[PDB]
Write a protein that binds this ligand. Sequence first.
Ligand SMILES: CCCCCCCCCC(=O)N[C@H]1CCOC1=O
Ligand SMILES: CCCCCCCCCC(=O)N[C@H]1CCOC1=O
Lengths: 184, 179
Amino acid sequence: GSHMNARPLPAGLTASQQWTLLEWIHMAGHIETEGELKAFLDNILSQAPSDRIILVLGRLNNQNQIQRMEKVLNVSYPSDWLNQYSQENFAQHDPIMRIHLGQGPVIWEERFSRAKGSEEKRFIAEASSNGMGSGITFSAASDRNNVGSILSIGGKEPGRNAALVAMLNCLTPHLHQAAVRIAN
Amino acid sequence: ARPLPAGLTASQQWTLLEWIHMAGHIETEGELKAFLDNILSQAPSDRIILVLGRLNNQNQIQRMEKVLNVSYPSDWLNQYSQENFAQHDPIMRIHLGQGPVIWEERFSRAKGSEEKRFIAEASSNGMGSGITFSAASDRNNVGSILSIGGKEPGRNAALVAMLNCLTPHLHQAAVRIAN
Ligand SMILES: CCCCCCCCCC(=O)N[C@H]1CCOC1=O
Ligand SMILES: CCCCCCCCCC(=O)N[C@H]1CCOC1=O
């Protein structure tokens, strides 16, 4: 069952990290509103003016890719970047929108380097000029409804912190269930 | 959100984290039942049920939406349902979201003659002692109780604190299954 197939918890966390992860997952399971989700992510993840954090709940295709955004839960992507992303249909050129939700974390660099299209390259240049040339995306999908969420965090630093990556990866299914409560 | 329990050992904390993590992945009724039975029947002849209900304005169950039996006796559930015991059961009067309620303590404080009649009947059916955990959500519109009948309710302080902490997550799972 889905409870048994829950992604495995991290091995080798410090006592401090284990306690933090327990706090995070316990708290996430109480989030009922957009306001609470944003405050929670601000509280546990926000670090600096240069932060780039967003959570997106989407309707999925047969490869667990987001076909339609159901709910966008912004924390620190620039307001006008989202406008531009909508206005210029970036979802069609953004390599991160092609991820198969429910796989492990995806470092942007690995997808950005494999760009072939001039237009994909243009999007990546534009993203870079907005502080989003590097980053990491965590994901989770429900088993019994075709919805899933991605948690994106900009910058090189998060992906190089092994403990944080493992912790955020385990938190992500809980953020997804929160997003589903918020969207309902 | 209720606070994490203080004073757990590292292995107890890890156990609780595993349970909350697993609970947050439950999407089906079969999954919730299997989860409760496999982890909570840590016991022998302890009797376990989860009930999801709509709440009145004092956080009491006013309508049962989902009964999720684990190990309440078939016969007791038959009797309870057939004789409308929910009316007279002091455990059904809990303000959902409060800390654990030990049945003995609640039973001794019951004044109504109907209440006292129910208690005697529960006792002769092996349902005389137990503990009930609870949680409420959605602006206190709905809530669940996790009830465990058995020998000495709150003996194992760490386990009681762990189950209290887990309960809101079991409630959210029940809500997912019932909606
Ligand atoms: C109108 C709502 C737009 C919401 C856009 C959500 C995009 C999620 C995937 C993501 O993190 N892509 C990064 C990669 C570089 O630049 C981005 O933006
Ligand atoms: C429609 C009947 C099914 C609902 C039965 C659920 C009862 C939940 C409250 C509870 O745990 N009360 C204990 C107290 C003594 O004996 C019980 O049973």
